[PDB]
From Swiss-Prot, chain A:
Protein name: Ribulose bisphosphate carboxylase small subunit
Pfam families cross-referenced by the UniProt entry: RuBisCO_small (PF00101)
Other remarks on this protein: RuBisCO folding and assembly commences when the nascent large subunit folds with the help of chaperonin GroEL-GroES. Both RbcX and Raf1 help folded RbcL release from the chaperonin and dimerize; dimeric Raf1 binds to RbcL(2) leading to an RbcL8-Raf1(8) complex. RbcS displaces Raf1, resulting in holoenzyme formation. The basic functional RuBisCO is composed of a large chain homodimer in a 'head-to-tail' conformation. In form I RuBisCO this homodimer is arranged in a barrel-like tetramer with the small subunits forming a tetrameric 'cap' on each end of the 'barrel'.
Higher taxonomy: Bacteria, Bacillati, Cyanobacteriota, Cyanophyceae, Nostocales
CDD domains listed in its UniProt record: RuBisCO_small (cd03527)
Organism, as annotated: Nostoc sp. (strain PCC 7120 / SAG 25.82 / UTEX 2576)
Function according to Swiss-Prot or TrEMBL: RuBisCO catalyzes two reactions: the carboxylation of D-ribulose 1,5-bisphosphate, the primary event in carbon dioxide fixation, as well as the oxidative fragmentation of the pentose substrate in the photorespiration process. Both reactions occur simultaneously and in competition at the same active site. Although the small subunit is not catalytic it is essential for maximal activity.
Curated annotation (Swiss-Prot), chain B:
UniProt-annotated location(s): Cytoplasm
Organism taxonomic ancestry: Bacteria, Bacillati, Cyanobacteriota, Cyanophyceae, Nostocales
GO CC annotations on file: cytoplasm
Span covered, complete protein: 205 to 361 of 361
Gene Ontology BP term (one): carbon fixation
Function: A major RuBisCO chaperone. Acts after GroEL-GroES chaperonin to fold and/or assemble the large subunit of RuBisCO (ccbL, rbcL). Cooperates with RbcX in RbcL folding, plays the major role in assembly of dimers into RbcL(8)-Raf1(8) intermediate complexes. RbcS replaces Raf1, leading to holoenzyme formation.
Annotated protein name in UniProt: RuBisCO accumulation factor 1
UniProt KW keywords: Carbon dioxide fixation, Chaperone, Cytoplasm, Photosynthesis
Family named by the database record: Belongs to the RAF family.
Quaternary structure and partners: Homodimer. Forms an RbcL(8)-Raf1(8) complex. Each Raf1 dimer clamps the exterior of an RbcL dimer, protecting it. The extreme C-terminus (residues 354-361) inserts into the catalytic pocket of RbcL where the Glu-157 forms a salt bridge with 'Lys-202'. This insertion probably contributes to the assembly of RbcL(8). Forms complexes of many stoichiometries with RbcL with and without RbcS. RbcX and Raf1 can bind simultaneously to RbcL.
Region C-terminal beta-sheet, annotated ranges: 17-143
Swiss-Prot record, chain E:
CDD domains: RuBisCO_large_I
Residues holding substrate: N92, T142, K146, R264, H296, S348
Species the sequence originates in: Nostoc sp. (strain PCC 7120 / SAG 25.82 / UTEX 2576)
Annotated function: RuBisCO catalyzes two reactions: the carboxylation of D-ribulose 1,5-bisphosphate, the primary event in carbon dioxide fixation, as well as the oxidative fragmentation of the pentose substrate in the photorespiration process. Both reactions occur simultaneously and in competition at the same active site.
Site (Transition state stabilizer): residue numbering on this chain: K303
Lineage: Bacteria, Bacillati, Cyanobacteriota, Cyanophyceae, Nostocales
Broad class of enzyme this protein falls into: lyase
Modification N6-carboxylysine occurs at: K170
Protein name: Ribulose bisphosphate carboxylase large chain
Entry's cofactor comment: Binds 1 Mg(2+) ion per subunit.
GO CC entries: carboxysome
C-alpha cells in the first residue's frame, strides 16, 4: 500500500475533517490560555501566500465563551468558497498560538 | 567564615597503592627471602605496622599488583633480566610475590640458587624450589623534580 | 593566593558569572582551588589594577552527596571580554583552566551572560516567533526525517528520499553530520537536487517545506559560498555543525543568516566530547547559551524518553535556557544562575533521539509547541517507505496536538490518541506496531 | 624466548609516599615529635626503621609529595565542622609538621595543653602549632 | 549489528584509521562496543562506506577498557576539511549510551588525505628561513599581567621583553579586543614596539598578534591589518575559534606570508581526562592538517617518563615527517605525513632559566620556549629577564654545539655563563 | 650515469609512475637511456638529497616484436609535483625529455597518478552519475549532431540547425572546433540564439536538451566571461578544446564548472599532434587521465568502427581509464599501470567518428550506457533534413537500447533491430539505405 498525492493545508490537516464539537473544544484551548482567537479567510492556501484575510476582528467578549464558533458558521454562510481558518493570538510571546483550517471549498 | 576541611574521599575508579616490603641489593641469601613475614591489611587505609628492621617501598596500585598476596621486592640491576632495548644496564626494582610457585614459559620465577637469589625463565619444570613468580619490574623516574612533585599550580600549557 | 576568593562579593548585574564543578586534587582545599579557577581564567599568577579585571570566586556550595567536589561560582567582570565574541568567553573562561594540575576534573556547569553582554551579540537570526512567521507553521512542534542511509546516496537519490519524506506532512528534513561533501555526493549537487525536491514537495502540498542544508565546510569562505548558494536556491534553512566548525564560523554564519533571511539549524556535533562526563568538560547548558548568543534558530537538545526524572529535569533545564526569555535559578532543574535574556530571540529545541510514532504523546507534552521533532535516527523507518512513514509521523503529531489542545492529559491519555488516530490513517496503523 | 614485563610508573599519581601513622586519637604531644622523620633513599624511595614502626600508603599527590615531613593521624570526622549529611567515619589526618607557620585559612595541629588536637584559629593563639593538616582522606564507599 | 566489527580487515593504505579508547558500560562485551564505536560514527550502499572495527587490543594493566581501532574509508570524508573528520568520527559516537567513557587516542590520516590539506603555512624549515633564526630553539615572553594593560603599556612591555634577546612575545588567550585594549591599537603599539626592538637588536623580532575574533570577517580584517603592519607572525586560538576559522586563516597565512602561532586554548576540556575526550595527539594532527607554524605542546619539565613520552609523542607527530607506530610513547598508528611541513613545538609551562639544558636536549632546535607561565617573573624586570632566558638559551646551545652532554654538564654551563652575564646570575637562583 | 636505473626498486603506492616508449639512438643501451628519461625529467645531469626527489627507472620490459624499443617504467615520487596541477605533471614528465638527443623517439604511453595525488585534483565537475542526474537521462548512451556546415552560418541560422536537431530526440548538439567567434558569428550572439533554441526544443519535447557551447577563448578572462554567460542563459553544458587551450585554462574551467553547475564537454582538438604516431608523442590515455584529473564530463574518445581488434582494445583501454573507478593493468588492452581513481567521478566517452544509423548496434555494444554518440562528422546528413535526421539517430538508439536490454546480442542480432525499427519509423526507413 502507498501514500496518495493529496494536497494538505495547515497544522491540523492530517486528521479527519474537523466537526463542530471538536472546534468548540479546540477554541476552548485558545481562549482559556488568555489568548484572543480570530477567523481568517482566503481564496487559496499557497505556500508563497502567507497572509490570510481577517474576518471582522479577533473577536472576544469574555474570559471564556462561544465567540469564534458562531462567527465561523456566519462565515460559512457568507463565504462558502473560501479557505476559512481559526487562528489564535498571543500578545506576550507575540505570535499565533494556532492556525488551522475549519472549512475548505 | 570557617574554611572547608580537605575532606578527600577515595573514588572507586582510582586504585590506591600497597606497601611492598623490600630486601637488599643482589646478591642476597635464600634464608633472607624466607624471613620476610606476611603483610596483612589494617583497614581502612592499609595501615601496616612492623616491630623489627625492614625496608618498605609503596608501589602504585596496578591490576596484577593489588591482586597479589605476598609481595616482596628485591633490588637488582637491569642486566639481571634480559636485554630489551638499546639502553644501558641501570637500577631495576623487582616485585615477586612468594605464593605464585608455578611453571610458566613466558613468566619469570625466582628460585634458590645455592643459598642465593637470581632470575631465570623456565622452559622445563625444574627440581629447584621456585620462590615465586615476578609481579612487576620497574626502574626509577627520570623527571625534573621541583615541579613534578612540588608544585600544584601548573597548567598543561 | 586567596585574593581571588572574595566570599562576601555580591556580584554585580553586569558581571559574567560562571559556575564550575571543581574536583580538586587531594590536599588542595576548596577555597584555594576555587581561587585558582578564578586565577588562570584571568589575571594569572603593580602594572595594572588587579581588583578591576580579576575573576573572583564568591561562593563555594559543596555538591550534595559527593565529597571532593563543589560548585565554584566565579564572577568575571564585563570589560574583560569582547563585545560580541562567544569565542572570547570560552577563551577566557574555559581556556587555560581545565588543564590546571591542582584539579582532577573541572566542569563548567553554567554561565550567566548579563543583560549588558547579551546585547552585544546578535542572538539567533530568527527566533521561535520569526521562524514560525517565515514558515507559517503555528501551534505544533515541527518535524523532520533524517535521510537514511547516510553515506553512499548520490545527490539525486538523496533528494528523492527528501521529496518522499517532505510529501507526507513532514516539515523539515535533516542533512547528516558526516555529509558536507564527499566524492559520491558534492554539496553543489546535493543542494541542487534538494531544492528541486523542496519546490516539488512545497508546490504539491502547500506548506513551506524546508531542508537543513549542511553548510559546514573546511574554510569560512567555502562555508559562505555554500550558504550563499542555498540563499540563491531560495532555501528557507541551512544547518551548521557548530562545535566542529567552532564559534567563529558559527558567529560568521549567524551574522550571515540574519543578513540573508536564511534560518540556521545548529547541530551539536562533537558535543559529547565535552558535555557527556558528569565530572569534567563543558555542560551543554553553557554550549546552549553559547549558541543562543551566536546563531541558531534550532539546536539539538537530544531527547527525553530514554532518561530518568533527574536526567530530564536537567535536559528541560537547558531547553528553557535557549527558548524562554527569563529563567529562574533552579539547580534541581540544572540551572545555576538566573538568566535574563533581554528579549533575545529564542532557539527551537530539537528532539532527535531514537524516536518514532509512540513518542508523540511524550515529546509534545515535554517539549512544547516551540520545538522540532526529528525522526529516523535510531528507529528502523517504516515498512511502506518514507511518504507513508512521514505521514505516520505527522498524523501522530496532530493527533497529539489536537489532544493537548482539548485538555487530554497526554501523560495518561496519550496512548489512546495514538491508537484512535491509527484508525483514521492507514499509513499510521501499519506504523502502530513497530 | 626471553620475555620480561615492564610496566613502569608513568603518570602523575604514581609516587606513593610512605607517610608515618600514629595511634588512634586521643594522644599526647609526644607522639608527633616522637615519630622519627622519613629519609627516603631516593632511587627507589627506600624507607626503613628498626624500632616498632608504623606508617600508611597514600597514592601521592601534588600536596602530599610537596610536603617535607607529612605524618598521617587516625581520627574521626567529628573534629571538623562538616556540613554534609555524610556519616561520621574514620579520617586519616595527613599532618604536615614541616610548615608550622600559622595561616588564618588552613587547619592546624595544636596540642591542647598536652593533647594533640585539630582546630581552626582566626587569630594566632598563644598555643604553639605542632603541624599543618594538608589532607584529610576518607575511605572508599 | 556485529557487521561493523571485521577483525580480519587488514586496513587499506587509503583508510582513515582511528584508535578510540573505549570504556564500555558494565555488561557490554568488547566486541559489541567496538562494533558500536564504529557504528554511530557512520551508517547508524553500506559495504563500501562503513566505519568498521578491525582490532580490539585491551589496555594492558586495566580491565573494562580497550583500544578499538576503527577503519573509516577515504571517500566518506571531505577533501581538505578537518571539521568533517571531527564531525564524522567524533560527532555522534561519544554520546553513545553503552559506553561509559570514549576517548579518541590517535588517528591516521593517510598519504591520500594529507595531500588534500594545506598543512602549515610555513614549516619548520620555511619559518626559520623567514626569521633567519637557525640552530637554536626560539624564545618567548607571555606579557604578564594579562588583563588591564593599555595598548601602549602593553606595547612597552613587549618592547622590554624583545630588547633582551627574546625572539617572540605572545599575546594572551583572552586578549582579542576588550574595552581597555582594542586590537587595532594593540596591534599598532606592538608593531611600533617591534620595529624599535628589531632596529635596536638587528634580529627579526616578532609578536604573536592574537587575531582570534567573533566572526571570520573580523578575523581576517584583524589579520589583514597585521599583514599591513609588516608583521612576521600572528596567532589563533584554534579550538575556541574552531577548525573552519583556523583553516580559513591557514589558507590566508600561506597566501599572505604571515606565520601562524596556533594556541591550544580550550584544549583541556577535551583531552585532560585520561578516559574520555579527544587526546591532543589527534588535535595536534588536526592542526597540522589545518594550519599552524607553531603549537603549544605544554611542557616537559613537570611530567614523569610516561607523561613526557606522550608529550614527546605528539611533538614528533607535529614536527617529524614519518613517525613509527610506538604505543608506549603514545603514537598508535604509523603516520606518514607525506612531506607536509612541520609545526613548531612551543614549550610554555613553568619553565625558567635552569630548564634550558633539558629543553634544548628534549625539544631540539625545532622549538619555541615560552616564559612567564608559572614562575614569579625576574627580580630585575623584563629586559634582564629576557636576557637571562637568552644567555641561558645560547649557553646551552653553545654547549650543545661542542658536544657537552646537557643532561649532566647542563647545570655547569648555566653556572659558567652566570659569570659572563649579570642578568643571568640574578635569575640563577630565583 | 645508471644511478637513476634502480631495477630492484619496488615503486611505492604514492609514486607517480610513468611508462615511456623509448626508441633510443643506436649504441645507447637500454638502461642508460631509461636512466636518462628518468634523469632529465627530474634531478638533471650534495646540495640536497638526490635519492628522495629523483626519478627512478625500475623496469625495462622490451616491446615484443620490435627491437630498439622498450617501455621504461619511471617512478617519480609524490612530493616532486604540485598539488592539483596537471600542467606540472606534464612540465615535469614530458617537459624536457622528448627532445633528448640520445633518443630517436620517446612516447609517454601511460602514467599512474596515485590515490595520494588524485585527491589533490578535482576530477570532473560532474561524473557519469551526476551528469545523468542533472540531465535526467538514464540507461542509454546520449546523442549529438554536429552542425554542418561549420563555417559561414550566422548565429540564428546556426541556432535553427540546433533547434532542428534538438527536436528529434537528440540530447546534445556540438559546437565546432573552429567556431569560437569569427566575424560572421560572434559568441555572444551564437550563445544567445542557441539558448533561444534549446528552451524552444526543451519546452517542446520535455527532455533536458543541451548544447556544447564553445567557451574556448583567447584569454582566461575571455573564457570565463564566455562561460559565465552560458551560466546566465541557464545552459546545462559548455565545451572546451583542452589541448589547444591548455591545462591551465582547462583546470580553471574545471574549477569554474564545479562551482557553477555547468557540465563541461572536453574536446580533444590538437590531440593528434601528440597521440597519433605509434613511436613518439603522448598517448591519449595519458591525456585521458590528464583531463579526468582536471575537468571534463565528456571527452571525445573518437570511434571504434574503423579500427581493428588491437586498435579498439587500446581504444577501449582508455575508455575504461576515464570512466571506471579501478582499472587493472592489461597491456594488450593498452593500460600499463593499474589505476585506482579513488572514487573520482567518471568522464563520459564520446563517440564521434564518421558514424550513422547502422552503427547504433556497434556503439551501444562497445561503448556502454555511460557514453555520448556524436553524429554528422563524416556521414552526409539525411535527405529529409535534421529533425528527421535526428529522429533516425534516436529511434536507432532506443531500438539498440531495447535490444541490448532483452538479451539480444547486438554483435550478431544488431542489424535485425535496425531493420525492424525502420518499419515503425518513417524517418528511419529513409535513413536505412544511406
Amino acid at each position: 500500500q502507498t501514500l496518495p498525492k493529496e494536497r494538505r493545508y495547515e497544522t491540523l490537516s492530517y486528521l479527519p475533517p474537523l466537526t463542530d464539537v471538536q472546534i468548540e473544544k479546540q477554541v476552548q484551548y485558545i481562549l482559556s490560555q488568555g489568548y484572543i482567537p480570530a477567523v481568517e479567510f482566503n481564496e487559496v492556501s499557497e505556500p508563497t501566500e502567507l497572509y490570510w484575510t481577517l474576518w471582522k476582528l479577533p473577536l472576544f467578549g469574555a474570559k471564556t465563551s462561544r465567540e469564534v464558533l458562531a462567527e465561523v458558521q456566519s462565515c460559512r454562510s457568507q463565504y462558502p468558497g473560501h479557505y476559512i481558518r481559526v487562528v489564535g493570538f498571543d500578545n506576550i510571546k507575540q505570535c499565533q498560538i494556532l492556525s488551522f483550517i475549519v472549512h475548505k471549498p | 567564615p570557617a574554611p572547608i576541611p580537605p575532606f578527600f574521599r577515595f573514588d572507586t575508579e582510582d586504585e590506591l597503592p600497597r606497601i611492598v616490603p623490600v630486601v637488599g641489593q643482589l646478591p642476597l641469601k635464600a634464608e633472607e627471602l624466607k624471613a620476610v613475614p606476611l603483610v596483612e591489611e589494617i583497614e581502612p587505609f592499609r595501615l601496616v605496622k612492623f616491630s623489627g628492621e625492614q625496608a618498605w617501598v609503596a608501589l602504585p596500585g596496578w591490576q596484577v599488583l593489588l591482586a597479589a598476596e605476598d609481595p616482596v621486592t628485591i633490588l637488582a640491576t637491569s642486566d639481571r633480566f634480559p636485554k630489551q632495548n638499546q639502553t644501558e644496564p641501570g637500577p631495576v626494582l623487582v616485585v615477586v610475590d612468594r605464593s605464585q610457585r608455578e611453571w610458566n614459559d613466558f613468566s619469570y620465577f625466582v628460585v634458590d640458587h645455592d643459598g642465593e637469589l637470581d632470575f631465570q625463565w623456565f622452559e622445563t619444570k625444574p627440581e629447584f624450589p621456585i620462590l615465586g613468580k615476578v609481579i612487576i619490574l620497574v626502574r626509577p623516574r627520570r623527571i625534573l623534580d621541583e615541579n613534578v612533585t612540588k608544585d600544584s599550580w601548573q597548567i598543561d600549557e | 593566593r586567596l585574593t581571588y576568593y572574595t566570599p562576601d562579593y555580591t556580584p554585580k548585574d553586569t558581571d559574567i558569572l560562571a559556575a564550575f564543578r571543581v574536583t580538586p586534587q587531594p590536599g588542595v582545599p576548596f577555597e584555594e582551588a576555587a581561587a585558582a579557577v578564578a586565577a588562570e581564567s584571568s589575571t594569572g599568577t603593580l602594572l595594572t589594577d588587579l581588583d578591576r579585571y580579576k575573576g573572583r570566586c564568591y561562593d563555594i556550595e559543596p555538591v550534595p552527596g559527593e565529597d571532593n567536589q563543589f560548585i565554584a561560582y566565579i564572577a568575571y567582570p564585563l570589560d574583560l571580554f569582547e563585545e560580541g565574541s562567544i569565542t572570547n568567553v570560552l577563551t577566557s573562561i574555559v581556556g587555560n583552566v581545565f588543564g590546571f594540575k591542582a584539579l582532577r576534573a573541572l566542569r563548567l556547569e553554567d554561565i550567566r551572560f548579563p543583560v549588558a553582554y547579551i546585547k552585544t551579540f546578535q542572538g539567533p537570526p530568527h527566533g521561535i516567533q520569526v521562524e514560525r512567521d517565515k514558515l507559517n507553521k503555528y501551534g505544533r512542534p515541527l518535524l523532520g526525517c533524517t535521510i537514511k542511509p547516510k553515506l553512499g546516496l548520490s545527490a539525486k537519490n538523496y533528494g528523492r528520499a527528501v521529496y518522499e519524506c517532505l510529501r507526507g506532512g513532514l516539515d523539515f528534513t535533516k542533512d547528516d553530520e558526516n555529509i558536507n561533501s564527499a566524492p559520491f555526493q558534492r554539496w553543489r549537487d546535493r543542494f541542487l537536487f534538494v531544492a528541486d525536491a523542496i519546490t516539488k514537495a512545497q508546490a504539491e502540498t502547500g506548506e513551506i517545506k524546508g531542508h537543513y542544508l549542511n553548510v559546514t565546510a573546511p574554510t569560512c569562505e567555502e562555508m559562505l559560498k555554500r550558504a550563499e548558494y542555498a540563499k540563491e536556491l531560495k532555501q528557507p534553512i541551512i544547518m551548521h555543525d557548530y562545535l566542529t566548525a567552532g564559534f567563529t564560523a558559527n558567529t560568521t554564519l549567524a551574522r550571515w543568516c540574519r543578513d540573508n533571511g536564511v534560518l540556521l539549524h545548529i547541530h551539536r556535533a562533537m558535543h559529547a566530547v565535552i558535555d557527556r562526563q558528569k565530572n569534567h568538560g563543558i555542560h551543554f547548558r553553557v554550549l546552549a547559551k553559547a549558541l543562543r548568543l551566536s546563531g541558531g534558530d534550532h539546536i539539538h537538545t537530544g531527547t527525553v524518553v530514554g532518561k530518568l526524572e533527574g536526567e530530564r529535569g536537567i535536559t528541560m533545564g537547558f531547553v528553557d535556557l535557549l527558548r524562554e526569555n527569563y529563567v529562574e535559578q533552579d539547580k534541581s532543574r540544572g540551572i545555576y544562575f538566573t538568566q535574563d535574556w533581554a528579549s533575545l530571540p529564542g532557539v527551537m529545541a530539537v528532539a532527535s533521539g531514537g524516536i518514532h510514532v509512540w513518542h508523540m504523546p511524550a515529546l509534545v507534552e515535554i517539549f512544547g509547541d516551540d520545538s522540532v521533532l526529528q525522526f529516523g535516527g535510531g528507529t528502523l523507518g517504516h515498512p511502506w517507505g518514507n511518504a507513508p512513514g512521514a505521514t505516520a509521523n505527522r498524523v501522530a503529531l496532530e493527533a497529539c496536538v489536537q489532544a493537548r489542545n482539548e485538555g487530554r492529559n497526554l501523560a495518561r491519555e496519550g496512548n489512546d490518541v495514538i491508537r484512535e488516530a491509527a484508525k483514521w490513517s492507514p499509513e499510521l496503523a501499519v506504523a502502530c506496531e513497530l
